[PDB]
Protein backbone atom coordinates (compact mmCIF):
# COMPACT_ATOMS: atom_id res chain seq x y z
CA UNK A 1 0.00 0.00 0.00
CA UNK A 2 1.31 3.49 -0.87
CA UNK A 3 1.01 6.05 2.16
CA UNK A 4 -1.93 8.48 1.97
CA UNK A 5 -2.16 11.86 1.83
CA UNK A 6 -3.99 14.59 2.01
CA UNK A 7 -7.86 13.91 -0.29
CA UNK A 8 -8.95 15.87 -2.59
CA UNK A 9 -12.13 16.03 -1.57
CA UNK A 10 -14.25 19.66 -0.08
CA UNK B 1 -4.22 33.69 -22.20
CA UNK B 2 -7.23 31.58 -23.91
CA UNK B 3 -9.12 33.04 -20.54
CA UNK B 4 -7.65 36.48 -20.73
CA UNK B 5 -11.15 38.49 -22.21
CA UNK B 6 -13.63 36.73 -19.10
CA UNK B 7 -14.29 38.20 -16.05
CA UNK B 8 -12.58 37.08 -13.17
CA UNK B 9 -16.21 36.28 -11.61
CA UNK B 10 -17.50 34.34 -15.10
CA UNK B 11 -14.41 32.50 -14.47
CA UNK B 12 -14.80 31.91 -10.79
CA UNK B 13 -18.78 30.64 -11.82
CA UNK B 14 -17.99 28.57 -14.42
CA UNK B 15 -14.80 26.61 -12.71
CA UNK B 16 -18.19 25.58 -10.30
CA UNK B 17 -20.04 25.12 -13.45
CA UNK B 18 -16.90 22.83 -13.99
CA UNK B 19 -16.48 20.55 -11.02
CA UNK B 20 -20.18 19.71 -10.69
CA UNK B 21 -19.95 18.26 -14.63
CA UNK B 22 -16.44 17.03 -13.27
CA UNK B 23 -14.61 18.78 -16.06
CA UNK B 24 -11.65 19.05 -14.20
CA UNK B 25 -9.19 20.46 -16.82
CA UNK B 26 -11.95 23.20 -17.71
CA UNK B 27 -12.04 24.05 -13.85
CA UNK B 28 -8.07 23.74 -13.63
CA UNK B 29 -8.17 26.03 -16.98
CA UNK B 30 -11.03 28.72 -15.03
CA UNK B 31 -8.64 29.28 -12.04
CA UNK B 32 -5.76 29.66 -14.13
CA UNK B 33 -7.15 32.83 -15.56
CA UNK B 34 -8.82 33.55 -12.27
CA UNK B 35 -5.46 33.26 -10.66
CA UNK B 36 -3.91 35.57 -13.99
CA UNK B 37 -6.11 38.56 -13.33
CA UNK B 38 -3.71 39.08 -9.96
CA UNK B 39 -6.16 39.44 -6.92
CA UNK B 40 -5.80 37.34 -4.32
CA UNK B 41 -8.05 34.27 -3.78
CA UNK B 42 -10.50 33.37 -1.23
CA UNK B 43 -10.86 30.42 0.73
CA UNK B 44 -13.68 29.44 -1.13
CA UNK B 45 -11.49 30.54 -4.20
CA UNK B 46 -8.59 28.33 -3.43
CA UNK B 47 -10.29 25.12 -2.39
CA UNK B 48 -11.65 25.75 -6.24
CA UNK B 49 -7.63 25.92 -7.83
CA UNK B 50 -6.74 22.89 -5.16
CA UNK B 51 -9.73 20.16 -6.50
CA UNK B 52 -8.88 20.96 -10.31
CA UNK B 53 -4.93 20.87 -10.56
CA UNK B 54 -4.87 17.50 -8.12
CA UNK B 55 -7.80 16.31 -9.97
CA UNK B 56 -5.56 16.19 -13.39
CA UNK B 57 -2.59 15.62 -12.02
CA UNK B 58 -3.99 13.01 -10.07
CA UNK B 59 -5.27 10.91 -13.34
CA UNK B 60 -1.65 11.35 -14.45
CA UNK B 61 0.06 9.91 -11.53
CA UNK B 62 -2.28 6.99 -11.42
CA UNK B 63 -1.60 6.15 -15.53
CA UNK B 64 2.28 7.19 -14.37
CA UNK B 65 2.73 4.28 -12.19
CA UNK B 66 0.50 1.89 -14.22
CA UNK B 67 2.90 2.23 -17.30
CA UNK B 68 6.10 2.77 -15.37
CA UNK B 69 4.89 -1.01 -13.48
CA UNK B 70 4.62 -2.13 -16.41
CA UNK B 71 7.95 -0.49 -17.92
CA UNK B 72 9.75 -2.37 -15.14
CA UNK B 73 8.20 -5.60 -15.08
CA UNK B 74 9.61 -6.24 -18.17
CA UNK B 75 9.53 -2.89 -27.82
CA UNK B 76 10.13 0.89 -26.93
CA UNK B 77 6.41 1.29 -26.77
CA UNK B 78 5.52 1.15 -23.15
CA UNK B 79 8.98 3.57 -22.47
CA UNK B 80 7.89 5.75 -25.11
CA UNK B 81 4.33 5.75 -23.89
CA UNK B 82 5.04 6.55 -20.10
CA UNK B 83 7.56 9.39 -21.50
CA UNK B 84 4.52 10.86 -23.15
CA UNK B 85 2.44 10.64 -19.73
CA UNK B 86 5.40 11.56 -17.71
CA UNK B 87 6.06 14.89 -19.57
CA UNK B 88 2.58 15.99 -19.63
CA UNK B 89 2.50 15.65 -15.71
CA UNK B 90 5.47 17.39 -15.79
CA UNK B 91 3.93 19.91 -17.58
CA UNK B 92 0.57 20.51 -15.58
CA UNK B 93 3.22 20.45 -12.43
CA UNK B 94 5.34 23.42 -13.88
CA UNK B 95 2.07 25.11 -14.89
CA UNK B 96 0.61 25.15 -10.84
CA UNK B 97 4.23 26.14 -9.96
CA UNK B 98 4.28 28.80 -12.23
CA UNK B 99 0.82 30.18 -11.18
CA UNK B 100 2.75 29.54 -7.12
CA UNK B 101 5.46 31.88 -8.20
CA UNK B 102 3.96 34.35 -10.77
CA UNK B 103 1.19 34.93 -8.20
CA UNK B 104 -0.36 33.32 -5.74
CA UNK B 105 2.71 33.35 -2.75
CA UNK B 106 3.38 37.07 -1.59
CA UNK B 107 5.18 38.17 1.56
CA UNK B 108 1.85 39.33 3.22
CA UNK B 109 -1.87 38.01 3.26
CA UNK B 110 -3.33 35.45 5.27
CA UNK B 111 -1.20 33.16 7.32
CA UNK B 112 -3.71 30.78 6.33
CA UNK B 113 -3.15 31.58 2.76
CA UNK B 114 0.85 31.82 2.96
CA UNK B 115 0.99 27.85 4.40
CA UNK B 116 -1.72 26.65 1.65
CA UNK B 117 0.26 27.97 -1.13
CA UNK B 118 3.48 26.73 0.31
CA UNK B 119 2.21 23.49 0.83
CA UNK B 120 0.83 23.29 -2.26
CA UNK B 121 4.35 24.63 -3.92
CA UNK B 122 5.73 21.22 -1.73
CA UNK B 123 3.26 18.69 -2.91
CA UNK B 124 3.47 19.73 -6.82
CA UNK B 125 7.72 19.91 -6.31
CA UNK B 126 6.96 16.26 -4.81
CA UNK B 127 4.77 15.13 -7.94
CA UNK B 128 7.69 16.06 -9.85
CA UNK B 129 10.12 14.01 -7.54
CA UNK B 130 7.96 11.05 -8.09
CA UNK B 131 9.25 10.95 -12.12
CA UNK B 132 12.16 12.77 -11.77
CA UNK B 133 16.00 11.24 -11.82
CA UNK B 134 19.16 12.90 -12.51
CA UNK B 135 20.44 16.43 -11.52
CA UNK B 136 16.70 16.97 -11.90
CA UNK B 137 15.95 14.92 -8.83
CA UNK B 138 17.78 16.13 -5.92
CA UNK B 139 17.13 19.48 -6.75
CA UNK B 140 13.71 19.05 -7.39
CA UNK B 141 13.14 16.74 -3.57
CA UNK B 142 15.34 19.91 -2.13
CA UNK B 143 12.93 22.92 -3.82
CA UNK B 144 9.91 20.51 -1.75
CA UNK B 145 11.22 20.19 1.93
CA UNK B 146 12.19 23.79 1.67
CA UNK B 147 8.55 24.61 0.99
CA UNK B 148 7.13 22.16 3.06
CA UNK B 149 9.65 22.77 6.08
CA UNK B 150 8.48 27.03 5.54
CA UNK B 151 5.02 26.53 5.44
CA UNK B 152 5.50 24.12 8.84
CA UNK B 153 7.36 26.85 10.43
CA UNK B 154 4.20 29.59 9.83
CA UNK B 155 1.71 26.62 10.83
CA UNK B 156 3.03 25.97 14.04
CA UNK B 157 3.49 29.50 15.07
CA UNK B 158 0.44 30.92 13.41
CA UNK B 159 -2.68 28.57 13.67
CA UNK B 160 -3.83 25.73 15.84
CA UNK B 161 -3.12 21.85 15.71
CA UNK B 162 -6.22 20.75 14.26
CA UNK B 163 -6.51 23.45 11.64
CA UNK B 164 -7.20 21.15 8.26
CA UNK B 165 -4.06 23.21 6.45
CA UNK B 166 -1.72 22.85 9.19
CA UNK B 167 -3.39 19.31 9.33
CA UNK B 168 -3.44 18.34 5.66
CA UNK B 169 0.26 20.05 5.11
CA UNK B 170 1.96 17.70 8.17
CA UNK B 171 0.32 14.77 6.86
CA UNK B 172 1.55 15.48 3.05
CA UNK B 173 5.18 16.60 4.35
CA UNK B 174 5.00 13.09 6.19
CA UNK B 175 4.18 11.07 3.14
CA UNK B 176 7.66 12.93 1.30
CA UNK B 177 9.46 11.89 4.26
CA UNK B 178 8.42 8.80 3.76
CA UNK B 179 8.12 8.08 0.14
CA UNK B 180 10.87 10.77 -1.44
CA UNK B 181 13.19 11.02 0.91
CA UNK B 182 13.38 7.45 2.38
CA UNK B 183 13.21 8.84 6.10
CA UNK B 184 11.18 6.21 7.73
CA UNK B 185 11.77 7.34 11.41
CA UNK B 186 10.84 11.40 10.22
CA UNK B 187 7.80 10.36 8.74
CA UNK B 188 6.75 8.27 11.86
CA UNK B 189 7.77 11.38 14.23
CA UNK B 190 6.08 14.00 12.57
CA UNK B 191 3.01 12.02 12.26
CA UNK B 192 2.93 10.91 15.70
CA UNK B 193 3.38 14.70 16.95
CA UNK B 194 0.95 16.07 14.71
CA UNK B 195 -1.94 13.71 15.49
CA UNK B 196 -0.89 13.73 19.17
CA UNK B 197 -0.66 17.76 19.51
CA UNK B 198 -4.23 17.70 17.49
CA UNK B 199 -5.63 15.29 20.31
CA UNK B 200 -3.67 17.18 23.13
CA UNK B 201 -6.21 20.47 21.79
CA UNK B 202 -9.11 18.97 20.52
CA UNK B 203 -10.89 21.82 22.11
CA UNK B 204 -9.65 23.98 18.87
CA UNK B 205 -11.69 22.61 16.16
CA UNK B 206 -13.59 24.94 14.28
CA UNK B 207 -17.39 24.42 14.03
CA UNK B 208 -17.60 24.88 9.63
CA UNK B 209 -13.67 22.75 9.30
CA UNK B 210 -13.98 20.31 12.27
CA UNK B 211 -14.85 17.47 9.66
CA UNK B 212 -11.82 18.24 7.75
CA UNK B 213 -9.91 17.66 10.93
CA UNK B 214 -10.93 14.74 12.26
CA UNK B 215 -10.50 13.09 8.48
CA UNK B 216 -6.85 14.11 8.20
CA UNK B 217 -6.22 13.01 12.05
CA UNK B 218 -7.28 9.66 10.74
CA UNK B 219 -5.26 9.42 7.60
CA UNK B 220 -2.09 10.66 9.84
CA UNK B 221 -3.14 7.53 11.94
CA UNK B 222 -3.49 4.93 9.19
CA UNK B 223 -0.14 5.65 7.49
CA UNK B 224 1.25 5.10 11.24
CA UNK B 225 -0.77 1.51 11.27
CA UNK B 226 0.68 1.08 7.69
CA UNK B 227 4.14 2.07 8.59
CA UNK B 228 4.15 0.32 12.43
CA UNK C 1 -1.95 13.03 -38.66
CA UNK C 2 0.34 13.28 -35.41
CA UNK C 3 -0.14 9.30 -35.78
CA UNK C 4 1.15 8.86 -39.25
CA UNK C 5 5.05 8.24 -38.78
CA UNK C 6 4.23 5.36 -36.23
CA UNK C 7 3.38 1.63 -37.17
CA UNK C 8 0.20 0.33 -36.67
CA UNK C 9 1.62 -2.49 -34.82
CA UNK C 10 2.75 -0.27 -32.44
CA UNK C 11 -0.33 2.03 -32.41
CA UNK C 12 -2.32 -0.81 -31.36
CA UNK C 13 -0.18 -1.65 -28.53
CA UNK C 14 -0.13 1.67 -27.18
CA UNK C 15 -3.99 1.92 -27.33
CA UNK C 16 -3.44 -1.43 -25.17
CA UNK C 17 -1.20 0.66 -22.76
CA UNK C 18 -3.45 3.67 -22.50
CA UNK C 19 -6.38 1.18 -21.53
CA UNK C 20 -4.73 -0.29 -19.12
CA UNK C 21 -3.89 3.51 -18.00
CA UNK C 22 -7.03 4.66 -18.34
CA UNK C 23 -6.27 7.64 -20.82
CA UNK C 24 -9.01 6.69 -23.15
CA UNK C 25 -8.24 9.71 -25.02
CA UNK C 26 -5.01 8.90 -25.70
CA UNK C 27 -6.48 5.31 -26.69
CA UNK C 28 -8.54 7.02 -28.73
CA UNK C 29 -6.35 8.84 -30.86
CA UNK C 30 -3.80 5.59 -31.13
CA UNK C 31 -6.63 3.30 -32.58
CA UNK C 32 -7.89 6.83 -34.84
CA UNK C 33 -3.86 6.36 -35.92
CA UNK C 34 -4.38 3.02 -36.24
CA UNK C 35 -8.17 2.92 -38.72
CA UNK C 36 -5.66 5.56 -40.70
CA UNK C 37 -3.06 2.88 -42.19
CA UNK C 38 -6.23 1.80 -44.17
CA UNK C 39 -6.42 -1.87 -43.26
CA UNK C 40 -9.65 -3.16 -41.67
CA UNK C 41 -9.49 -4.09 -38.08
CA UNK C 42 -10.20 -7.23 -36.08
CA UNK C 43 -12.21 -7.83 -33.71
CA UNK C 44 -10.26 -7.03 -30.61
CA UNK C 45 -9.05 -3.95 -32.37
CA UNK C 46 -12.87 -2.93 -32.94
CA UNK C 47 -13.17 -3.87 -29.42
CA UNK C 48 -10.40 -1.21 -28.12
CA UNK C 49 -11.85 2.01 -30.99
CA UNK C 50 -15.62 1.28 -29.20
CA UNK C 51 -14.29 1.36 -25.70
CA UNK C 52 -12.39 4.42 -25.94
CA UNK C 53 -14.10 6.45 -28.39
CA UNK C 54 -17.36 5.83 -26.09
CA UNK C 55 -15.60 6.46 -22.80
CA UNK C 56 -14.38 9.78 -24.57
CA UNK C 57 -17.97 10.73 -25.65
CA UNK C 58 -19.53 9.56 -22.46
CA UNK C 59 -17.91 11.62 -20.07
CA UNK C 60 -19.12 14.76 -22.56
CA UNK C 61 -22.72 13.66 -22.47
CA UNK C 62 -22.27 13.46 -18.55
CA UNK C 63 -21.05 16.66 -18.50
CA UNK C 64 -23.60 18.27 -21.11
CA UNK C 65 -26.34 16.63 -19.46
CA UNK C 66 -25.28 18.43 -16.05
CA UNK C 67 -24.77 21.64 -17.17
CA UNK C 68 -27.84 21.30 -19.50
CA UNK C 69 -29.89 20.77 -16.32
CA UNK C 70 -28.46 23.57 -14.61
CA UNK C 71 -29.57 26.04 -17.65
CA UNK C 72 -33.11 24.17 -17.70
CA UNK C 73 -33.34 25.16 -13.88
CA UNK C 74 -32.35 28.39 -14.29
CA UNK C 75 -25.87 35.95 -16.42
CA UNK C 76 -24.55 33.89 -19.76
CA UNK C 77 -22.08 31.90 -18.22
CA UNK C 78 -23.98 28.62 -17.92
CA UNK C 79 -25.25 28.64 -21.64
CA UNK C 80 -21.95 29.56 -22.36
CA UNK C 81 -19.98 26.64 -21.13
CA UNK C 82 -22.74 24.54 -22.15
CA UNK C 83 -22.04 25.05 -25.64
CA UNK C 84 -18.45 24.82 -25.17
CA UNK C 85 -18.91 21.53 -24.02
CA UNK C 86 -21.66 20.70 -27.24
CA UNK C 87 -18.97 21.84 -29.34
CA UNK C 88 -16.36 19.28 -28.22
CA UNK C 89 -18.90 16.38 -28.63
CA UNK C 90 -20.06 17.05 -31.72
CA UNK C 91 -16.35 17.63 -32.83
CA UNK C 92 -15.75 13.84 -31.57
CA UNK C 93 -18.86 12.32 -33.01
CA UNK C 94 -17.34 13.73 -36.26
CA UNK C 95 -14.41 12.15 -35.69
CA UNK C 96 -15.73 8.86 -35.23
CA UNK C 97 -18.41 9.29 -38.03
CA UNK C 98 -15.80 10.55 -40.63
CA UNK C 99 -13.45 7.48 -39.52
CA UNK C 100 -17.07 5.33 -40.16
CA UNK C 101 -17.73 6.87 -43.60
CA UNK C 102 -13.95 7.42 -44.84
CA UNK C 103 -12.60 4.01 -43.67
CA UNK C 104 -14.27 1.35 -42.22
CA UNK C 105 -18.08 0.91 -43.36
CA UNK C 106 -16.80 -1.08 -47.14
CA UNK C 107 -19.04 -3.14 -49.45
CA UNK C 108 -17.48 -6.41 -48.29
CA UNK C 109 -15.76 -7.98 -44.90
CA UNK C 110 -17.20 -9.80 -41.74
CA UNK C 111 -21.06 -9.09 -41.72
CA UNK C 112 -20.20 -9.33 -37.87
CA UNK C 113 -18.11 -6.38 -39.11
CA UNK C 114 -20.52 -4.07 -41.05
CA UNK C 115 -23.06 -4.67 -38.74
CA UNK C 116 -20.91 -3.32 -35.61
CA UNK C 117 -20.08 -0.41 -37.82
CA UNK C 118 -23.32 0.70 -38.69
CA UNK C 119 -24.35 0.15 -35.25
CA UNK C 120 -21.63 2.49 -34.11
CA UNK C 121 -23.04 4.86 -36.91
CA UNK C 122 -26.15 4.85 -35.18
CA UNK C 123 -24.69 5.53 -31.94
CA UNK C 124 -22.98 8.80 -32.72
CA UNK C 125 -26.18 10.04 -34.61
CA UNK C 126 -27.46 9.23 -31.62
CA UNK C 127 -25.33 11.25 -29.69
CA UNK C 128 -25.49 14.40 -32.19
CA UNK C 129 -29.24 14.56 -31.77
CA UNK C 130 -29.43 14.21 -27.75
CA UNK C 131 -28.08 17.78 -28.33
CA UNK C 132 -29.19 18.89 -31.66
CA UNK C 133 -32.03 21.56 -32.43
CA UNK C 134 -32.98 22.45 -35.73
CA UNK C 135 -32.91 21.72 -39.33
CA UNK C 136 -29.95 19.96 -37.94
CA UNK C 137 -31.78 17.82 -36.23
CA UNK C 138 -34.35 15.93 -37.92
CA UNK C 139 -31.65 15.63 -40.86
CA UNK C 140 -29.53 13.79 -37.78
CA UNK C 141 -32.12 11.48 -36.80
CA UNK C 142 -33.15 10.21 -40.27
CA UNK C 143 -29.49 9.30 -40.11
CA UNK C 144 -28.90 7.59 -36.95
CA UNK C 145 -32.32 5.58 -37.69
CA UNK C 146 -31.23 4.45 -41.64
CA UNK C 147 -28.08 3.47 -40.52
CA UNK C 148 -29.40 1.03 -37.35
CA UNK C 149 -31.96 -0.14 -39.69
CA UNK C 150 -29.90 -0.96 -42.68
CA UNK C 151 -27.32 -2.87 -39.21
CA UNK C 152 -30.85 -4.55 -38.20
CA UNK C 153 -31.89 -6.00 -41.63
CA UNK C 154 -28.08 -7.51 -42.10
CA UNK C 155 -28.03 -8.92 -38.47
CA UNK C 156 -30.96 -10.89 -38.68
CA UNK C 157 -30.01 -11.79 -42.26
CA UNK C 158 -26.38 -13.33 -41.17
CA UNK C 159 -26.70 -13.58 -37.06
CA UNK C 160 -28.11 -15.88 -34.41
CA UNK C 161 -30.56 -13.89 -32.33
CA UNK C 162 -27.96 -14.13 -29.12
CA UNK C 163 -24.71 -12.74 -30.98
CA UNK C 164 -23.66 -9.43 -28.99
CA UNK C 165 -23.05 -7.30 -31.87
CA UNK C 166 -27.07 -7.97 -32.80
CA UNK C 167 -28.34 -7.79 -29.25
CA UNK C 168 -26.73 -4.58 -28.83
CA UNK C 169 -27.51 -3.04 -31.57
CA UNK C 170 -31.20 -4.11 -31.11
CA UNK C 171 -30.84 -2.70 -27.62
CA UNK C 172 -29.76 0.52 -28.83
CA UNK C 173 -31.95 1.00 -31.66
CA UNK C 174 -34.94 0.84 -29.05
CA UNK C 175 -33.22 3.20 -26.97
CA UNK C 176 -33.18 5.30 -29.70
CA UNK C 177 -36.92 4.75 -30.74
CA UNK C 178 -37.83 5.60 -26.96
CA UNK C 179 -35.42 8.51 -26.40
CA UNK C 180 -35.25 10.30 -29.40
CA UNK C 181 -37.59 9.62 -31.77
CA UNK C 182 -40.47 9.23 -29.03
CA UNK C 183 -41.60 6.25 -30.26
CA UNK C 184 -42.35 3.86 -26.83
CA UNK C 185 -44.48 1.41 -28.63
CA UNK C 186 -41.70 0.93 -31.05
CA UNK C 187 -38.71 0.88 -28.31
CA UNK C 188 -41.30 -1.99 -26.60
CA UNK C 189 -41.88 -4.03 -29.13
CA UNK C 190 -38.71 -4.00 -30.42
CA UNK C 191 -36.85 -5.37 -27.21
CA UNK C 192 -39.53 -7.62 -26.19
CA UNK C 193 -39.13 -9.14 -29.60
CA UNK C 194 -34.67 -8.86 -29.53
CA UNK C 195 -35.12 -10.81 -25.69
CA UNK C 196 -37.68 -13.38 -26.88
CA UNK C 197 -35.99 -14.52 -29.56
CA UNK C 198 -32.80 -14.94 -27.96
CA UNK C 199 -34.45 -17.00 -25.33
CA UNK C 200 -36.56 -18.73 -27.67
CA UNK C 201 -32.98 -19.53 -29.99
CA UNK C 202 -30.65 -19.32 -26.17
CA UNK C 203 -28.61 -22.33 -27.73
CA UNK C 204 -26.89 -20.49 -29.82
CA UNK C 205 -25.09 -18.97 -27.24
CA UNK C 206 -21.65 -18.83 -28.06
CA UNK C 207 -18.46 -20.12 -25.90
CA UNK C 208 -16.12 -16.93 -26.32
CA UNK C 209 -19.18 -14.04 -25.89
CA UNK C 210 -22.08 -15.62 -23.89
CA UNK C 211 -21.70 -13.31 -20.94
CA UNK C 212 -21.90 -10.93 -23.33
CA UNK C 213 -25.30 -12.20 -24.46
CA UNK C 214 -26.57 -12.48 -21.25
CA UNK C 215 -25.76 -9.20 -20.11
CA UNK C 216 -27.48 -7.81 -23.25
CA UNK C 217 -30.69 -9.67 -22.23
CA UNK C 218 -30.76 -8.10 -19.24
CA UNK C 219 -30.47 -4.70 -19.91
CA UNK C 220 -32.86 -5.87 -22.25
CA UNK C 221 -35.03 -6.84 -19.69
CA UNK C 222 -34.47 -3.82 -17.38
CA UNK C 223 -36.03 -1.32 -20.20
CA UNK C 224 -38.61 -3.10 -20.51
CA UNK C 225 -40.02 -2.81 -16.15
CA UNK C 226 -39.10 0.75 -16.92
CA UNK C 227 -40.93 1.60 -19.79
CA UNK C 228 -43.85 -0.77 -18.40
CA UNK D 1 -34.10 7.18 -14.80
CA UNK D 2 -32.51 7.13 -18.60
CA UNK D 3 -33.25 4.34 -20.37
CA UNK D 4 -29.98 2.08 -20.49
CA UNK D 5 -28.03 1.32 -23.82
CA UNK D 6 -24.82 -0.82 -24.49
CA UNK D 7 -22.31 -0.79 -21.82
CA UNK D 8 -18.92 0.01 -22.50
CA UNK D 9 -17.20 -3.18 -21.25
CA UNK D 10 -15.27 -5.92 -21.98
C1 LIG E 1 -9.62 28.90 3.98
C2 LIG E 1 -8.88 28.09 2.92
O1 LIG E 1 -7.71 28.37 2.63
N1 LIG E 1 -9.56 27.14 2.29
C3 LIG E 1 -9.05 26.40 1.15
C4 LIG E 1 -7.95 25.35 1.33
C5 LIG E 1 -7.99 24.62 2.66
C6 LIG E 1 -6.84 23.66 2.81
N2 LIG E 1 -6.79 22.69 1.70
S1 LIG E 1 -5.78 21.41 1.86
O2 LIG E 1 -4.85 21.69 2.91
O3 LIG E 1 -5.32 21.04 0.56
C7 LIG E 1 -6.90 20.17 2.39
C8 LIG E 1 -7.64 19.49 1.44
C9 LIG E 1 -8.55 18.53 1.84
C10 LIG E 1 -8.78 18.30 3.20
C11 LIG E 1 -9.78 17.31 3.65
F1 LIG E 1 -10.86 17.91 4.13
F2 LIG E 1 -9.31 16.49 4.56
F3 LIG E 1 -10.21 16.53 2.67
C12 LIG E 1 -8.05 19.05 4.12
F4 LIG E 1 -8.26 18.85 5.45
C13 LIG E 1 -7.13 20.00 3.75
C14 LIG E 1 -6.98 23.25 0.35
C15 LIG E 1 -8.12 24.24 0.32
C1 LIG F 1 -15.84 -9.62 -33.16
C2 LIG F 1 -16.11 -8.15 -32.87
O1 LIG F 1 -16.56 -7.41 -33.76
N1 LIG F 1 -15.78 -7.70 -31.67
C3 LIG F 1 -15.82 -6.29 -31.29
C4 LIG F 1 -17.16 -5.58 -31.09
C5 LIG F 1 -18.26 -6.47 -30.54
C6 LIG F 1 -19.58 -5.73 -30.43
N2 LIG F 1 -19.45 -4.51 -29.61
S1 LIG F 1 -20.83 -3.76 -29.15
O2 LIG F 1 -21.90 -4.24 -29.99
O3 LIG F 1 -20.56 -2.36 -29.05
C7 LIG F 1 -21.04 -4.39 -27.53
C8 LIG F 1 -20.36 -3.78 -26.50
C9 LIG F 1 -20.47 -4.29 -25.21
C10 LIG F 1 -21.23 -5.43 -24.97
C11 LIG F 1 -21.33 -6.01 -23.61
F1 LIG F 1 -20.61 -7.12 -23.51
F2 LIG F 1 -22.58 -6.28 -23.27
F3 LIG F 1 -20.88 -5.20 -22.68
C12 LIG F 1 -21.85 -6.05 -26.05
F4 LIG F 1 -22.59 -7.18 -25.85
C13 LIG F 1 -21.76 -5.56 -27.34
C14 LIG F 1 -18.27 -3.67 -29.88
C15 LIG F 1 -17.02 -4.52 -30.02
CL1 LIG G 1 3.71 7.58 -27.39
CL1 LIG H 1 10.23 29.70 13.32
CL1 LIG I 1 -16.99 28.88 -21.65
CL1 LIG J 1 -33.65 -7.55 -45.83
MG1 LIG K 1 -11.88 40.51 -14.40
MG1 LIG L 1 12.97 -10.69 -22.21
MG1 LIG M 1 11.28 11.45 -20.15
MG1 LIG N 1 2.03 0.79 -40.23
MG1 LIG O 1 -35.09 34.68 -12.42
MG1 LIG P 1 -24.12 25.62 -29.60
Known amino acids: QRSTSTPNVH | ?43 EERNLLSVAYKNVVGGQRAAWRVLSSIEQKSGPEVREYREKVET ?10 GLLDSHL ?5 DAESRVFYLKMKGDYYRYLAEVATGDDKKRIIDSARSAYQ ?24 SVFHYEIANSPEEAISLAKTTFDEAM ?9 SYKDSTLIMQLLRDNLTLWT
Open chain 2, 1 to 43: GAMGSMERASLIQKAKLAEQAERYEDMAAFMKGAVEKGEELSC
Open chain 2, 150 to 173: EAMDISKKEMPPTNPIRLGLALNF
Open chain 2, 200 to 208: ADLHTLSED
Open chain 2, 88 to 97: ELQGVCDTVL
Open chain 2, 105 to 109: IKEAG
